Amino acid sequence: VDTCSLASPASVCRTKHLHLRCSVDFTRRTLTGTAALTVQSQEDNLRSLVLDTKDLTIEKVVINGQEVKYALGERQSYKGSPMEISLPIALSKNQEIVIEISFETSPKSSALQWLTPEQTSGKEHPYLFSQCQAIHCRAILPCQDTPSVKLTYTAEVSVPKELVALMSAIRDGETPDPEDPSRKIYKFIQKVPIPCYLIALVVGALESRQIGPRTLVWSEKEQVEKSAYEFSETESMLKIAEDLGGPYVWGQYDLLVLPPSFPYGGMENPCLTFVTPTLLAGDKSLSNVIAHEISHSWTGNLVTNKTWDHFWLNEGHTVYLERHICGRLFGEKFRHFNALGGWGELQNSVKTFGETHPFTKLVVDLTDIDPDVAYSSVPYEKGFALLFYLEQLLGGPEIFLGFLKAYVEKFSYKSITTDDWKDFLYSYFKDKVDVLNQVDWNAWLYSPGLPPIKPNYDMTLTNACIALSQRWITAKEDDLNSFNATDLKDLSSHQLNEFLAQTLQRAPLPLGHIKRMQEVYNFNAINNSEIRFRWLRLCIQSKWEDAIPLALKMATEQGRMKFTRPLFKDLAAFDKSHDQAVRTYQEHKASMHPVTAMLVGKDLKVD
Ligand SMILES: CC(C)C[C@H](NC(=O)[C@@H](O)[C@H](N)Cc1ccccc1)C(=O)O
Ligand SMILES: Oc1ccc(CCc2cc(O)cc(O)c2)cc1
Ligand SMILES: [Yb+3]
Ligand SMILES: [Yb+3]
Ligand SMILES: [Yb+3]
Ligand SMILES: [Zn+2]
Secondary structure: OOOOOOOOOOOOEEEEEEEEEEEEEOOOOEEEEEEEEEEEEOOOOEEEEEEEEOOOEEEEEEEOOEEOOEEEOOOOHHHOEEEEEEEEEEEOOOOEEEEEEEEEOOOOOOOEEEEOHHHOOOOOOOEEEEOOOOOOHHHOOOEOOOOOOEEEEEEEEEEEOOOEEEEOOEEEEEEEEOOEEEEEEEEEEEEEEEEHHHOOEEEEOOEEEEEEOOEEEEEOHHHHHHHHHHOOOHHHHHHHHHHHHOOOOOOOOEEEEOOOOOOOOEEOOOOEEEEOHHHOOOOOOOOHHHHHHHHOOOEOOOEEEOOHHHHHHHHHHHHHHHHHHHHHHHOHHHHHHHHHHHHHHHHHHHHHHOOOOHHHOOOOOOOOOOHHHHOOOHHHHHHHHHHHHHHHHHOOHHHHHHHHHHHHHHHOOEEEOHHHHHHHHHHHOHHHHHHHOOOOHHHHHHOOOOOOOOOOOOOOOOHHHHHHHHHHHHOOHHHHHHOOHHHHOOOOHHHHHHHHHHHHOOOOOOHHHHHHHHHHHOHHHOOOHHHHHHHHHHHHHOOOOOHHHHHHHHHHHOOOHHHHHHHHHHHHHOHHHHHHHHHHHHHHHHHOOHHHHHHHHHHHOOO
């Protein structure tokens, strides 16, 4: 059972297709239109069914050309309001009908961010973008909002004619809107069955530049050139991903670089991955995020977690493939470096949560828990650690990539649980079952805390980071003189980032050490967002008042939650900046992304 959804489950009925016809009204900040669901009964004598909704206004529900009775249940917090529809004729098993629902969204849709012209690059036009994962699609349209159900879709979207609509689907043409010549209608087709969390829409002043045989980059005009360069390795990553996962089935792989308030580094919307402009480091150094979202084209979008309790299946396998792509491009030592960094992030998460916390388990129970609140690095890095351990247990990366490809083939177009995975693992490695029975399954899958076994990691690229961080940590006042810009001479941006991650784990350091570090390394000049993030964190946690405006500026001028949440939390923890931190949140709150606003508020214990 999907405890995050109020809709009829897949055992009762299944949505096969959605046809969406809607109009984007920037004046009212509403999407208005009709969602036509092709629904297949899985039961004999089926007479009603229930859909998820959230802050939607339902005008009517039409079946066989007649309006039918429906009822909106009481709101259940972040789950929204269940919508029961009374079918006019009882359905037999496997019978399909079409239900057309006329609806309109709320300007406060938690799926959507509506941006004024000032919040964009061009300053002339507004902009809208969606973010449905995990359970926000119900805030756009009535659906069975669960990844246990996969459906194809088509859509016709009317927007002001000077703007462009894109969706997680193949572009199917554009025309003037017959009902309003100030508007265009953009059409879309997604022929591959997907979970509804993968439905996505952007509307804005978008331009495109081709960067590979199946990839355009889309953004506002002022970011197109830089994005084309930043993401030029995209085709080479697709090719390696295909080698590891099997055929890329989705047609196009385009990229959309969103405005800075986009709450995530990336989102694997099929045919059109969304990314944060905070990837635009200028040197392609943050391109692992592209490798990662590309990997979802197999692990997540093709093989999908059946409920959100099993999210690690999505994320852990994806981080596993991500790291192989980057290992192919840059070497096995680099794969190990990033693998070990991830174990470090898992250390941080488990320390933050506490080693007995329920959300340090690999498989969790999200009953009564808002997924946006439970979200962390655990499913990512504890999932990846399990896979990496198993790789090492079962004979190495070549052997384990064999399993990964077979696993993708086996479960393509399906939604599965941890036991499905484990079951196939045992079937695939049936000649190594005695070895598999040596794994402590209950601990890995179901216990809180760090995993029972740490994998083995090559240290080559990590050693210099640890060495420098330990120099700083053990330095006394009289040792500060020995530090110099030449310390960084042979470190890549990745190593500079890991140096800062190591040092941040021991924060605070003495204020004089941090001032010296700015003195000799000039980290204030680094605009790499990962590096700047950790640096400002280290500065604020070490109580350097100079870094306060820098941390505030970064927290507000972009809204990637990975950066914005810990910066606000750090600033609220520092007595000198606490009052400014809450005031600044209060001031920005109305124009923030709705999920980010909610989480930062809880973080800060404000409103
Ligand atoms: C390299 C990755 C770890 C980057 C990471 N992005 C992802 O994991 C995306 O694939 C996720 N789909 C982001 C996400 C997860 C849950 C709910 C909403 C959005 C991110 O930081 O955004
Ligand atoms: O969008 C989503 C989807 C799933 C979740 C739940 C993710 C999770 C899994 C886990 O094993 C441990 C966690 O601490 C958190 C959170 C957000
Ligand atoms: Yb066509
Ligand atoms: Yb079995
Ligand atoms: Yb000394
Ligand atoms: Zn992911």
